[PDB]
């Protein structure tokens, strides 16, 4: 797949003025734009291949972000009232929306989710024509809006505008965005006690972010109990990850790490060598 | 590109 996603965060700060508001845009696993109402309170480029867009684009995106911030300010007041919370506490409204392309480059699917204070609130259905309450009483405002109308405007965005511009972005940044960088792999050995050592399987400088690291033992079909770290950014646009297995000291060469990544023509197998 | 519209959330 390819995806165009935005991540919106609004945080109320009662007494200290209007809520903090941040939007970030991603094409696949590459951030390309950001808005911050505390920062130049505008949408700004965050990938090199975005820097030569006209003021028309930046003015439009700035106002869309601004308008979202203002509506999220209204939503935070509504949600405070809904959960019967104090006007003194800080609360968080999060909004995620994205469209994806299939192999053919046509619309595959869209999605939108809201969260209040880190909990699922409201989800756009897979048909994109109605909203599902995840929390009880969660809705599009019956009184001041329309479930069907809201879904329709988001559906048009996801099926049309989101797909159209995902293509424009993939073209503008194709040298980086469409390049598969396979993981550089190795295994390190770390004695932790007299009787046990940690085998750590490394994947470095890979793109995109999706990757599978599994440990197997020779003579055992099942995969072993594995410590996985969160996939982390290198800061250069590539990612890092490792999987660790605790094994008996002296028995390290009986274990294999198996690495699966889009940029690898077939799965890679590594074995620690002393 | 961002959507022009942010959904208005409600209660009940």
């Amino acid at each position: 797949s390819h995806s165009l996603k935005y991540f919106h965060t609004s945080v109320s700060r009662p007494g200290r003025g209007e809520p903090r508001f941040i939007s970030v845009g991603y094409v696949d696993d590459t951030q390309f734009v950001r808005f911050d109402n505390d920062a130049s309170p505008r949408m700004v480029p965050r990938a090199p291949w975005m820097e030569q867009e006209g003021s028309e684009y930046w003015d439009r995106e700035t106002r869309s972000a601004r308008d979202t911030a203002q509506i999220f300010r209204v939503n935070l007041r509504t949600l405070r009232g809904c959960y019967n919370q104090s006007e003194a506490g800080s609360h968080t409204l999060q909004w995620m929306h994205g469209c994806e392309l299939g192999p053919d480059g046509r619309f595959l699917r869209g999605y939108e989710q809201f969260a209040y204070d880190g909990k699922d609130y409201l989800t756009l259905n897979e048909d994109l024509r109605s909203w599902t309450a995840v929390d009880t009483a969660a809705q599009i405002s019956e009184q001041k809006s329309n479930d069907a109308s809201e879904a329709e405007h988001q559906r048009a965005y996801l099926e049309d505008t989101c797909v159209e511009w995902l293509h424009k972005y993939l073209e503008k940044g194709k040298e980086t965005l469409l390049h598969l960088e396979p993981p550089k792999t190795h295994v390190t050995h770390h004695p932790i006690s007299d009787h046990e050592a940690t085998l750590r399987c490394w994947a470095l400088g890979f793109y995109p972010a999706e990757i599978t690291l599994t440990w197997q033992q020779d003579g055992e079909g099942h995969t072993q109990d594995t410590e996985l770290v969160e996939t982390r950014p290198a800061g250069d646009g590539t990612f890092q990850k490792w999987a660790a297995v605790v094994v008996p000291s002296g028995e390290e060469q009986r274990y294999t790490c198996h690495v699966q990544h889009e940029g690898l023509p077939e799965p890679v197998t590594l074995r620690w060598k002393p | 590109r961002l959507p022009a519209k942010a959904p208005l959330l409600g209660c009940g």
């Epitope: 209007e18 106002r63 869309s64 308008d67 203002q70 509506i71 300010r73 209204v74 007041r77 405002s141 009184q143 001041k144 809006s145 329309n146 069907a148 109308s149 809201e150 329709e152 405007h153 048009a156 | 022009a4 519209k5 208005l8």
Partner: T-cell receptor
Amino acid sequence: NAGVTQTPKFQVLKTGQSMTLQCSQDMNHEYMSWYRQDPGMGLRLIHYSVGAGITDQGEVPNGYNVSRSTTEDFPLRLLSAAPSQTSVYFCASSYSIRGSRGEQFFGPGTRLTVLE
Amino acid sequence: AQEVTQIPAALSVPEGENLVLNCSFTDSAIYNLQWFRQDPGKGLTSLLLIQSSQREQTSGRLNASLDKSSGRSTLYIAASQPGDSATYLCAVTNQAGTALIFGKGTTLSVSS
């Protein structure tokens, strides 16, 4: 309910003078807006509010300020009156913009003339 | 932005004749379309509200239609009367869905 009230009904200003057009509504409406009406230009949005403490620029914001410290009041200030601000000024409110209860109520308007 | 046009700017019909007032808008992504009457020296008064999912709204000799996809509304005034003489203004929800954008209106004169 009085609906949307506007003062004054008529006003003359000298170029450079300041002026607050008063608007209030007693319908508890979150949504309020200011328009100017000019011949062959129609009804143009100056500023709008989606709730107490929340304001944004419309089609023609330049030369005008608004505040929304309360639900009831949405005053429009001309900071430095110019002849180009000679117009009829309408304040509007509604229960909602996106809902079935979407009826927009207008004030009687303020005829403003700015003279050198 | 959302752009609203009303054709024609001025209309003059003999009383008893059917007439259409036209409203077209550039962005079909609207929640509501609203028709208003304005008498000289007075404010606007709402005639008809049509929701995005609705196709027509009726009020006596007034029947407004909505076609979102085409971006059109037509206010049909059947058997027009001198008292219908006024300015008719069309409004749609702006792109943000936070305020109403108005067409420049049609001045209707139903001659006695």
